[PDB]
Amino acid sequence: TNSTKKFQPFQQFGRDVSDFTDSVRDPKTLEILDIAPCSYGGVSVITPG
Amino acid sequence: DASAYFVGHLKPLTMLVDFDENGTIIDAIDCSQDPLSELKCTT
Numbered sequence A: 001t002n003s004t005k006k007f008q009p010f011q012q013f014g015r016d017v018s019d020f021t022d023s024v025r026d027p028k029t030l031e032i033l034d035i036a037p038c039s040y041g042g043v044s045v046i047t048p049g
Numbered sequence B: 001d002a003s004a005y006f007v008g009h010l011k012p013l014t015m016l017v018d019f020d021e022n023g024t025i026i027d028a029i030d031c032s033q034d035p036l037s038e039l040k041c042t043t
């Protein structure tokens, strides 16, 4: 997804507290993006037996 | 005219750094200089 941050010319990657890379700069068109997994939320199955 | 320069030497130390929401370094505390900064390094 489109991001909002911007950093120095000598910086390419940014990481989270858990050292997960969440910000990447596209090398062709100089824009900043954001990554997030599409596995999210909790499910629960109810069975009568 | 007359000018002056200052020269210091580097030492191996342990640093505590903090960044703001733009990644700019705004403060730094070195340990081993006084007990309060040692407490801040520990905590």
Ligand SMILES: *[C@@H]1O[C@H](CO)[C@@H](O)[C@H](O)[C@H]1NC(C)=O
Residues within 6 Å of the ligand: B020, B021, B022
């Ligand atoms: C961070 O960047 C924004 C946009 O350039 C700027 O307005 C702001 O003063 C900067 N600093 C902080 C502490 O938000």
